[PDB]
Design a protein around this motif. Structure first.
Motif, mmCIF file in Angstrom:
data_model
loop_
_atom_site.group_PDB
_atom_site.id
_atom_site.type_symbol
_atom_site.label_atom_id
_atom_site.label_comp_id
_atom_site.label_asym_id
_atom_site.label_seq_id
_atom_site.Cartn_x
_atom_site.Cartn_y
_atom_site.Cartn_z
ATOM 1 N N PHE A 163 -32.226 -46.106 -16.515
ATOM 2 C CA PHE A 163 -33.585 -45.895 -16.191
ATOM 3 C C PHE A 163 -34.406 -46.820 -15.621
ATOM 4 C CE2 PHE A 163 -32.670 -42.544 -19.576
ATOM 5 C CZ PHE A 163 -33.415 -41.255 -18.833
ATOM 6 N N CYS A 164 -35.286 -46.723 -14.667
ATOM 7 C CA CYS A 164 -35.929 -47.849 -14.060
ATOM 8 C C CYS A 164 -36.657 -48.416 -15.039
ATOM 9 C CB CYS A 164 -36.752 -47.054 -12.958
ATOM 10 S SG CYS A 164 -35.944 -45.878 -11.898
ATOM 11 N N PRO B 102 -35.955 -40.595 -22.697
ATOM 12 C CA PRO B 102 -36.457 -39.208 -21.785
ATOM 13 C C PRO B 102 -35.184 -38.543 -21.752
ATOM 14 C CG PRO B 102 -36.752 -41.299 -20.626
ATOM 15 C CD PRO B 102 -36.405 -41.585 -22.103
ATOM 16 N N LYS B 103 -33.982 -38.871 -22.249
ATOM 17 C CA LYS B 103 -32.872 -38.270 -21.794
ATOM 18 C C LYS B 103 -32.205 -37.642 -23.040
ATOM 19 C CE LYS B 103 -29.642 -36.622 -20.939
ATOM 20 N NZ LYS B 103 -29.628 -36.027 -19.505
ATOM 21 N N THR C 70 -32.458 -50.488 -15.404
ATOM 22 C CA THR C 70 -32.260 -50.859 -16.719
ATOM 23 C C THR C 70 -31.343 -50.076 -17.487
ATOM 24 O OG1 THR C 70 -34.304 -52.346 -16.522
ATOM 25 C CG2 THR C 70 -33.577 -51.425 -18.745
ATOM 26 N N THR C 71 -30.185 -50.252 -17.963
ATOM 27 C CA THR C 71 -29.406 -49.456 -18.873
ATOM 28 C C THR C 71 -29.865 -49.684 -20.303
ATOM 29 O OG1 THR C 71 -27.835 -49.427 -17.431
ATOM 30 C CG2 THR C 71 -27.136 -48.993 -19.621
ATOM 31 N N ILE C 72 -29.741 -48.925 -21.269
ATOM 32 C CA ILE C 72 -29.973 -48.761 -22.474
ATOM 33 C C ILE C 72 -28.874 -49.195 -23.249
ATOM 34 C CG2 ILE C 72 -31.189 -47.471 -24.576
ATOM 35 C CD1 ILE C 72 -32.398 -45.467 -22.522
ATOM 36 N N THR C 73 -29.200 -50.040 -24.370
ATOM 37 C CA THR C 73 -28.044 -50.510 -25.276
ATOM 38 C C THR C 73 -27.885 -49.634 -26.148
ATOM 39 O OG1 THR C 73 -28.668 -52.794 -24.740
ATOM 40 C CG2 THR C 73 -27.145 -52.152 -26.663
ATOM 41 N N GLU C 74 -28.383 -48.413 -26.316
ATOM 42 C CA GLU C 74 -28.021 -47.456 -27.362
ATOM 43 C C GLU C 74 -27.185 -46.366 -27.156
ATOM 44 O OE1 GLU C 74 -31.683 -47.064 -29.854
ATOM 45 O OE2 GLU C 74 -31.025 -44.882 -30.462
ATOM 46 N N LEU D 33 -28.455 -41.431 -10.040
ATOM 47 C CA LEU D 33 -29.810 -40.620 -10.136
ATOM 48 C C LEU D 33 -30.846 -40.933 -11.252
ATOM 49 C CD1 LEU D 33 -28.934 -37.166 -8.384
ATOM 50 C CD2 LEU D 33 -30.124 -39.334 -7.341
ATOM 51 N N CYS D 34 -32.198 -40.932 -11.291
ATOM 52 C CA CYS D 34 -32.877 -41.138 -12.402
ATOM 53 C C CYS D 34 -33.414 -39.776 -12.954
ATOM 54 C CB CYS D 34 -34.116 -42.125 -12.061
ATOM 55 S SG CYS D 34 -35.122 -42.592 -13.378
ATOM 56 N N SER D 35 -33.430 -39.759 -14.361
ATOM 57 C CA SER D 35 -33.669 -38.417 -15.118
ATOM 58 C C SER D 35 -35.322 -38.338 -14.975
ATOM 59 C CB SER D 35 -33.427 -38.608 -16.685
ATOM 60 O OG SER D 35 -32.204 -37.880 -16.678
ATOM 61 N N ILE D 36 -36.039 -39.274 -14.659
ATOM 62 C CA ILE D 36 -37.407 -39.341 -14.501
ATOM 63 C C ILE D 36 -37.894 -39.309 -12.911
ATOM 64 C CG2 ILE D 36 -39.553 -40.503 -14.726
ATOM 65 C CD1 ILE D 36 -38.057 -42.042 -17.287
ATOM 66 N N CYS D 37 -37.429 -40.375 -12.162
ATOM 67 C CA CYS D 37 -37.814 -40.232 -10.687
ATOM 68 C C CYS D 37 -36.938 -39.378 -9.712
ATOM 69 C CB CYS D 37 -37.371 -41.723 -10.120
ATOM 70 S SG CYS D 37 -38.182 -43.159 -10.910
ATOM 71 N N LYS D 38 -35.969 -38.766 -10.409
ATOM 72 C CA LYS D 38 -34.983 -38.074 -9.835
ATOM 73 C C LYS D 38 -34.539 -38.375 -8.466
ATOM 74 C CE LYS D 38 -34.637 -34.353 -13.054
ATOM 75 N NZ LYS D 38 -35.319 -32.974 -12.775
#
Ligand SMILES: [Zn+2]
Ligand SMILES: [Zn+2]
Length: 72
Positions: free
Chosen positions: A38-39, A54-55, A29-33, A17-22
């Motif tokens: 996240f889309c 935003p997470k 797209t995955t963060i490298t941090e 699931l997306c923390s934004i789109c829900k």
């Protein structure tokens, strides 16, 4: 008009699931941090207003250390 179609059930990590789109993702797209999903448009859009995640709320300084003007 109906244009209604659905019917899919599976058992997998509820993180998809997306923390934004829900909902569902598109680019994935995955963060490298913080290693969060996240889309492209989502993470990219959030980076336009806020240079943070935003997470976890972390200032991801990967894309560019500069904010940049309002040039489309
Ligand atoms: Zn999203
Ligand atoms: Zn994060």
């Amino acid at each position: 008009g109906s244009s209604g179609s659905s019917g899919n059930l599976s058992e997998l990590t509820p993180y998809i699931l997306c923390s934004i789109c829900k909902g569902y993702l598109i680019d994935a797209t995955t963060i490298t941090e913080c290693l969060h999903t996240f889309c492209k448009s989502c993470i990219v859009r959030h980076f336009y207003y806020s240079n943070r995640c935003p997470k976890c709320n972390i200032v991801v300084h990967q894309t560019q250390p500069l904010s940049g003007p309002s040039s489309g």
